[PDB]
Design a protein around this ligand. Sequence first.
Ligand SMILES: Nc1ncnc2c1ncn2[C@@H]1O[C@H](CSSC[C@H]2O[C@@H](n3cnc4c(N)ncnc43)[C@H](O)[C@@H]2O)[C@@H](O)[C@H]1O
Ligand SMILES: Nc1ncnc2c1ncn2[C@@H]1O[C@H](CSSC[C@H]2O[C@@H](n3cnc4c(N)ncnc43)[C@H](O)[C@@H]2O)[C@@H](O)[C@H]1O
Ligand SMILES: Nc1ncnc2c1ncn2[C@@H]1O[C@H](CSSC[C@H]2O[C@@H](n3cnc4c(N)ncnc43)[C@H](O)[C@@H]2O)[C@@H](O)[C@H]1O
Ligand SMILES: Nc1ncnc2c1ncn2[C@@H]1O[C@H](CSSC[C@H]2O[C@@H](n3cnc4c(N)ncnc43)[C@H](O)[C@@H]2O)[C@@H](O)[C@H]1O
Lengths: 259, 259, 259, 259
Amino acid sequence: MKYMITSKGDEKSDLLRLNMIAGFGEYDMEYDDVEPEIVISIGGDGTFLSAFHQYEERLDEIAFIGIHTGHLGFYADWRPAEADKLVKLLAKGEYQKVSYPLLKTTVKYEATYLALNESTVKSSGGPFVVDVVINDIHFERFRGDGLCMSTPSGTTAYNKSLGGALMHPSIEAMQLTEMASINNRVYRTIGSPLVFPKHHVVSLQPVNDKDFQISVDELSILHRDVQEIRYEVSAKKIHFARFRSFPFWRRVHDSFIED
Amino acid sequence: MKYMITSKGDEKSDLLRLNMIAGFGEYDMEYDDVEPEIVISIGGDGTFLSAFHQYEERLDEIAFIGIHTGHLGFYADWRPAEADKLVKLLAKGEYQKVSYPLLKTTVKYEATYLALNESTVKSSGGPFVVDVVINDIHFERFRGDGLCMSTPSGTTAYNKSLGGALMHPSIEAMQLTEMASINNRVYRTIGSPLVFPKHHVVSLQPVNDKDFQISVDELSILHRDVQEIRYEVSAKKIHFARFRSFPFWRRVHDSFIED
Amino acid sequence: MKYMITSKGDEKSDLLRLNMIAGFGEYDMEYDDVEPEIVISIGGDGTFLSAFHQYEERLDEIAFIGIHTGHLGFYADWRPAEADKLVKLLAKGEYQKVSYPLLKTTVKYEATYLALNESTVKSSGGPFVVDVVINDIHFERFRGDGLCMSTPSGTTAYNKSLGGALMHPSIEAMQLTEMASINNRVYRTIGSPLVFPKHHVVSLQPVNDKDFQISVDELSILHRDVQEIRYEVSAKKIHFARFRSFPFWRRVHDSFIED
Amino acid sequence: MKYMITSKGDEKSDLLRLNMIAGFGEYDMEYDDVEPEIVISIGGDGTFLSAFHQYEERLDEIAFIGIHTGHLGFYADWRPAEADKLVKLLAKGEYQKVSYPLLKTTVKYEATYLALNESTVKSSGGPFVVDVVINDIHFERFRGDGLCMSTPSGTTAYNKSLGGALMHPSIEAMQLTEMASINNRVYRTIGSPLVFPKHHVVSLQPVNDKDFQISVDELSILHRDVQEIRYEVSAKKIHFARFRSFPFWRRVHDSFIED
Ligand SMILES: Nc1ncnc2c1ncn2[C@@H]1O[C@H](CSSC[C@H]2O[C@@H](n3cnc4c(N)ncnc43)[C@H](O)[C@@H]2O)[C@@H](O)[C@H]1O
Ligand SMILES: Nc1ncnc2c1ncn2[C@@H]1O[C@H](CSSC[C@H]2O[C@@H](n3cnc4c(N)ncnc43)[C@H](O)[C@@H]2O)[C@@H](O)[C@H]1O
Ligand SMILES: Nc1ncnc2c1ncn2[C@@H]1O[C@H](CSSC[C@H]2O[C@@H](n3cnc4c(N)ncnc43)[C@H](O)[C@@H]2O)[C@@H](O)[C@H]1O
Ligand SMILES: Nc1ncnc2c1ncn2[C@@H]1O[C@H](CSSC[C@H]2O[C@@H](n3cnc4c(N)ncnc43)[C@H](O)[C@@H]2O)[C@@H](O)[C@H]1O
């Protein structure tokens, strides 16, 4: 199979990558970073996120795998010590694929983005004020620091820090959380995180200022003269190559409770 | 069709019920509170919850409708002034059915319960301490006041007060929230609400004391010599009779933002 | 000096107590559990809390010291291994006293209680609903699970679990936190914890049911036919005997961040 | 007395100001915006905050008064309709002064600032990571969006939105709240807001990046090559001219519960 390997670019990760490439040389495996079928990321979740965005135009043709040299690995299944076992298993085509939901962001002045973790919106530094419209229905006028829309796998990231729920990635949904909402006599938001199914469309519309800092995972990005920001669950999915059982809730336990 | 009407039992609700029965007398509609096909609740959500539990052995044969004389009505679609329009529409079979997910609780010493909103667990007054087991995997030792497991329609109730996410009821899931968790050097919980798909089983197991106060919606219930408490999304669903568009997110807006 | 020692009552604590008493026998130190000037607690914070309540009628005549055999010790300064150094330092009168604020609870049908950590109020099992009156001014109608009023040293306990602020115990104040407040169109609470100075009086008044479960630290206590529950910062203080520097914020760091 | 009046600068506020000046012309009152003894603000809390910062070098020589043409007025005592009664009462020297605590911010590369509401720190857009040092004791490594340090009167503002406690302004203290803290296996913060007495010093120190966006009330301000950010309760206080009883907790009730 065609494969490539991205590295965090430190000594540890670069050497592990060189060793895996040497190991793949002993099988029918071609290194191709233009049209790979397998993308191996060696580093942290940041490296993994970069791999995803490198190859987001061929998501349906790629299965992703992560090796963690950190630190945490929510998108790592593998420790560096098991790199040889992985080469072997991967060479013999010994895996089933698992798909996770993604988030489509549309910015209208249209620019469209795909997020694996989340997309957030904040001011250019003045007040944030936006109207939140759900399936063409006006839901609330949000005043505060910003808003975050998360995929299920993203719920353990920024979402978690904002008080969001952790959602199993078999659920096809997206989750909206508030950053520092203003609530008083005058000014009212729901307060609570909101979980939306497939085919629901959440639209953010400016009230005064039309300049926003928009993030998509690790990318952040001042957008000027914005008319609308639209969120929905993508029709596209990320596919992981999976080689043993490592359930989501065990990954959550390992990352947050104890390992 | 066979129908019945439950009332909150105050003057307003009883008279509305008598008037609807008189109105149904002008159509091919038989009052039968043993085997109804339509159950009309007149009161608040408490009255509605009682109606549901009255008839939970024939959920697949019944479509529910709520008239609110309160106050709030998350399970009300109807104001008292529209009672005549409802009699008319209902008589002519002019409706599509909408189904919402339910929560199965199993208490092992087996007693099984069905919740429309939630089931909660707290101590008999001493410390609460339970082990939380997800699909046979030990996830955490919870120390605090209690735990709440919510259906999607229940997410606006007790769940919301505990910091839970609001979930659209088209999502087949259940949501676990903490009550006053202890977190320190020693003692660790996830903190965050957790959303589980269909077929996931969350099990609570005692550590010291085996006596718990368990609630299922409005029913609460000291259980003695408990071995296990098991939660999963039910295979059963509640069916509503629905006569116009009144989207979930608009109901949420109306109940929490402004009406 | 007159002293006594309370023990958690396990093997470890009882033996440490016997050894300290033997060590005190070599100085001018009289064991007197009726009118002690020093009260040594050996166990956890629960043991310490019991010691405090044992002797709350002679708080101005007593200095308290805690040895932790647990676990956590917010009211422990001492590990079991330093028990000999403590006997020595204490025998030679080698200490300055530090005072912490206390909370006065008055229950009117008057019963008055003193809390070192907190006093809480919940239902007898039905709805909790109370009117919150601050210095004779009606502030809110609280609907939810209950309320907690904390001393500064108590802010690390139940208060912390309810989202309360941690307050340095040099601040003469009390802090009110909510348990699962209901907030919607109809029903409104402040949401936020509230910190009150000395001489402010917070009064809770029943709306329907007049039966409440009231806790004062580890004591809990169904009160019937309640007219009022009144909170204010006590004029009385707890005195600790203190032998080296162990700042509050370092105790907090050690108990919650890492030790 | 020497006085001046700042206006929000809309039609309503400018005309009210012109009318008050005309009314003051009938008493022994000199308009002096260089060395006033009374500073009247007409607008919102934003206008009030600007007045405070206009005159922060002569805080001990000035008593402040606010008229609200909004909206909310936490620093307003007065509605526009009572402007005449105020001119009269103020002319006759008919008032007692009330003082509120302030927050000193020191930024070391020293620049010092005084806040009436709060000072916050966030990244220049990369990760925020800072070491939190309390009275020279290392307390935590904070990873997240930022931190907020609030005065007692500021606790109803940004602080409240971040989950902070509301504190009565007779308490001489400052309150530190987190913005979106990261908490996992690796990375740990206290979570809870922290309340510090007078004479406690909280210091923030950079870990990697040394560029921060620092706010002081409405002023925000990229600081480059930062070595330290230091917070303590100021020795300086803001004085209000006060003409009738309008207790803090009633102001809170009116702004957040109902008016
Ligand atoms: N999926 C997931 N779960 C848990 N942790 C994750 C995940 N993805 C990344 N990370 C962790 O994010 C950290 C840097 S990844 S770079 C971009 C991500 O930063 C995250 N981020 C940004 N600000 C915050 C805050 N304030 N809190 C939590 N997470 C944040 C956000 O989700 C972005 O997608 C590092 O500790 C990773 O292990
Ligand atoms: N589904 C739903 N959404 C929103 N509000 C609801 C719902 N169902 C009932 N209610 C409201 O609950 C109140 C009493 S219903 S009796 C049993 C329910 O009480 C609810 N409960 C109990 N304690 C609390 C607290 N502390 N907070 C919120 N909700 C609570 C819980 O969900 C139970 O299912 C009344 O205001 C109803 O309009
Ligand atoms: N002051 C203080 N700080 C931190 N931890 C404390 C403190 N005092 C006691 N404790 C801890 O409380 C636990 C049992 S003490 S018995 C009575 C106390 O229980 C506490 N309690 C009760 N329910 C809860 C919940 N749900 N969360 C936190 N704390 C709770 C409350 O403050 C009472 O005063 C044990 O881990 C002690 O180390
Ligand atoms: N003291 C006080 N209490 C309550 N509300 C206040 C106060 N001071 C100002 N305000 C309100 O802040 C709003 C704009 S004032 S301009 C600078 C202030 O903005 C506030 N701010 C900035 N971001 C937020 C967020 N996200 N939430 C709450 N407050 C925020 C912060 O406290 C700054 O001092 C307006 O509604 C005022 O009535």
